[PDB]
């Protein structure tokens, strides 16, 4: 019965049409250092073939620099460590 | 050929797909029934063909002869595998030869199927329903169609199909139709109705389509756009 | 298949419905080569009728033959009678009573016509659109169909209709289809398309069914913008 259950945009169409549109998220998902894209588009045709949310099973990541005593070093950090693994 | 016509009915794509046997049948009509009526097959190059299997015992006019055929594999059907039916009889002074080749289909076009549910008006009659599987935007010809219901190839007595006619956009495109009658209630439930279309231009020569009340036009729209100021993930 | 072969011809009603003129012509393919022909046209009642004329001496077979047309009254021809000519040959009397008249009687049934619009995929592709006209459940055969756009008869090249075919339910029932191509732009807010159907088993000898963008059903959206 559930025609489409895209978790990228949380669009579920039971044939009901449910779409959650979280406001807090940066334009670019690759890094947080990007404008805040408030616009949201939900093309049903395209969706039935640039994500906004994050899947529960998906654990994104981005590389960031760190400097303590020596030289700047790049280390990976997960945007949702709870999903990855008080 | 001018005197004494010779029929030649090659194997259609349906038998290649379902029966899986390319048999080239050739016969002679309006001829005498004596002996010496030998029907043989050979390639124009000179090579012969397999034995004529599954001959026809009875004849329309009890013509004492043996139809010529060959159980060749599908490889002898692509573009460059021609054939020749030779017939000999005492009445004629010399044997008659009939050469046949492939149409060499050109301007291949991926079939574009656009199905749509039965018309609303039928529902008011409430006596019977009919479904269409019109196909268009395809080339070359020789497109097969069938109506499946949960892997149940429906008999030709249930569904009918038409030959393809030239499309108005251009002559390098054809279109065909295939209807199937059922009861209105059966259509109401959907019953996993599907249409299977086989065409050489298709990458796999098999394409399935289906339709239901939902597919056509749902009047209701229980749209629920949850704003969810802050979810981040799937809330 | 054994001699007396008749090549495919258009016996359809449009033969007289497009120009509104009775036309009577009967011939056999590959006729015997002879000078002139023993024309003879008479009704089954017994009285003779005006013979055809306008013999066009032009054939691809180069076989000396004759072919023409004859216009007769409508009451008698459409009197439930399968009018048949009686043209014979000069060498030997051979009355060819070929039924150029349509089959009257047998069984009358309303040809149910449904006018269905193009699929959503076709319009979304935004390349073209096809409107379907299904004619079903009628008798006898030879049901004609045509298209119009508010008195604007579109060229036959635009649309196309299948010749009648028997129905799977029973031989008496038939069915046919007529497709019409058109751009999507007009199908959105352009003009209305009408599929007229002509059949002997009709009260006015013709009906009509129109369609346009709103041919579907009114959509009832229920939007619920749930917010924090
Ligand atoms: C049958 C019915 O109650 N339908 C409504 C629906 O139209 C509306 O969108 C929804 C929002 O709460 O509530 C329910």
| Chain B residue set in contact with C, beta carbons under 8 Å | 29-30, 114-116, 118-122, 125, 128, 130, 132, 134, 136, 157-160, 162, 165, 168-169, 175, 177, 179-181, 217, 219-230
- Closest by CA position to B41, among listed B76, B91, B93, B1: B76
Distance CA A34, CA A37 (A): 9
State residue A62 phi and psi, 5-degree precision. -150, 145
- Contact between C118 and B115 using a beta-carbon 8 Å cutoff: no
**Strand pairing partners for B2?**
none
Which residue in chain B is spatially nearest to A6 when comparing CA positions?
A: B234
- Contact between C130 and B114 using a beta-carbon 8 Å cutoff: yes
Contacts of C217 in chain B (CB under 8 A): 120, 217, 219
Distance B212 CA to ligand 1 centre (A): 23
Helix (H) or strand (E) holding B187: helix B184-189
Q: Which of A36, A53, A57, A78 to mutate to test the interface with B (most CBs of B within 10 A)?
A: A53
Helix (H) or strand (E) holding B180: strand B178-182
Maximal C-alpha separation, chain A: 59
* Planar angle of CA B118, C219, C129, nearest 5 degrees: 50
- Contact between C132 and B136 using a beta-carbon 8 Å cutoff: no
Contacts of A18 in chain B (CB under 8 A): 224-226
Distance CA C123, CA C48 (A): 59
Q: Which of B222, B223, B227 to mutate to test the pocket of ligand 1 (most atoms within 8 A of CB)?
A: B222
- Contact between C114 and B132 using a beta-carbon 8 Å cutoff: no
Distance CA B180, CA B163 (A): 15
Helix (H) or strand (E) holding C113: strand C112-116
Distance CA B106, CA A3 (A): 38
- Atom 2 in ligand 1: which residue has the minimum CA distance? B222
Peptide bond into B64 cis (omega under 30): no
Distance from CA of A11 to the nearest CA of B (A): 10
Q: Do B27 and B19 meet the contact criterion of CB atoms below 8 Å apart?
A: no
Q: Do B9 and B23 meet the contact criterion of CB atoms below 8 Å apart?
A: no
Expressed in Å, this structure's resolution amounts to 3.6
Give the number of C-alpha atoms closer than 13 A to the C-alpha of residue A75, restricted to the C-beta side: 7
Structure tokens at B196: 């299977």
Return all residues near C53 (Cβ < 8 A) that are at least 6 apart: C68, C69, C70
Of B121, B159, B160, the CB nearest to C165: B160
For residues A64, A67, A68, A73, the Cα torsion angle rounded to the nearest 10 degrees is: 70
| Pairing label, strands C112-116, C129-136 | antiparallel
Lookup result for tokens 């394409």: B207
- Contact between B232 and A21 using a beta-carbon 8 Å cutoff: no
- Contact between B226 and A20 using a beta-carbon 8 Å cutoff: yes
Distance from CA of C183 to the nearest CA of B (A): 12
Which residues does ligand 1 sit against, CB inside 6 Å?
A: B 222; C 222, 224
Chain B adjacent subunits, 3+ CB pairs under 8 A = A, C
| Ligand 1 atom nearest residue C223's Cα | 9
Of B30, B118, B158, the CB nearest to C168: B158
B44 torsion bin: left (phi>0), alpha (psi -120 to 50), beta (else) = alpha
- Contact between C2 and B30 using a beta-carbon 8 Å cutoff: yes
Instruction: Give the 3-state secondary structure of residue A52.
Output: coil
Q: Do B159 and C168 meet the contact criterion of CB atoms below 8 Å apart?
A: yes
State residue B22 phi and psi, 5-degree precision. -90, 100
* Planar angle of CA C168, C172, C174, nearest 5 degrees: 60
- Closest by CA position to B177, among listed C123, C43, C130, C14: C130
Distance CA C179, CA C130 (A): 6
Lookup result for tokens 């119009």: C148
Chain C adjacent subunits, 3+ CB pairs under 8 A = B
Instruction: Give the 3-state secondary structure of residue B160.
Output: strand
Which residue in chain C is spatially nearest to B175 when comparing CA positions?
A: C179
Instruction: Give the 3-state secondary structure of residue B23.
Output: coil
Which residue in chain B is spatially nearest to C3 when comparing CA positions?
A: B30
- Closest by CA position to C176, among listed C137, C120, C222: C137
| Ligand 1 atom nearest residue C222's Cα | 9
Burial (CB count within 10 angstroms: exposed 0-12, middle 13-18, buried 19+), residue C66: middle
Is A84 within 8 Å of chain B by CB?
no
């Amino acid at each position: 019965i559930v025609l489409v259950d895209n978790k990228c945009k949380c669009a579920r169409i039971t044939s009901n049409i449910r779409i959650i549109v979280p406001l807090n998220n940066r334009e670019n998902i690759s890094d947080p250092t990007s404008p805040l894209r408030t616009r949201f588009v939900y093309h049903l045709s395209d969706l039935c073939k640039t994500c906004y949310t994050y899947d529960r099973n998906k654990c994104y990541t981005a590389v960031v620099p760190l400097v303590y005593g020596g030289e700047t070093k790049m280390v990976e950090t997960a945007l949702t460590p709870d999903a990855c693994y008080h | 050929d001018t005197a004494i016509r010779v029929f030649a009915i090659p194997p259609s794509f349906a038998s290649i797909f379902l029966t899986k046997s390319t048999k080239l049948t050739c016969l002679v009509t309006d001829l005498t029934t004596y002996d010496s009526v030998t029907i043989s097959w050979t390639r124009q190059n000179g090579e012969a063909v397999k034995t004529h299997t599954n001959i026809s015992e009875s004849h329309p006019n009890a013509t004492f002869s043996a139809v010529g055929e060959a159980s060749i594999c599908e490889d002898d059907w692509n573009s460059g595998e021609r054939f020749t039916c030779t017939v000999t009889h005492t009445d004629l002074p010399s044997p008659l030869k009939q050469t046949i080749s492939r149409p060499k289909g050109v301007a291949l076009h991926r079939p574009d199927v656009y199905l749509l549910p039965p018309a609303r008006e039928q529902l008011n009659l409430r006596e019977s329903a009919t479904i269409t599987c019109l196909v268009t935007g395809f080339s070359p010809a020789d497109v097969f169609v069938q109506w499946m219901q949960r892997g149940q190839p429906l008999s030709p007595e249930k569904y009918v199909t038409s030959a393809p006619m030239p499309e108005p956009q251009a002559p390098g495109r054809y279109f065909a139709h295939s209807i199937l009658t059922v009861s209105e209630e059966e259509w109401n439930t959907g019953e996993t109705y599907t249409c299977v279309v086989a065409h050489e231009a298709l990458p796999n020569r098999v394409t399935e389509r289906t339709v239901d009340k939902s597919t056509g036009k749902p009047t209701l729209y229980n749209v629920s756009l949850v704003m969810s100021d802050t979810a981040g993930t799937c809330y």
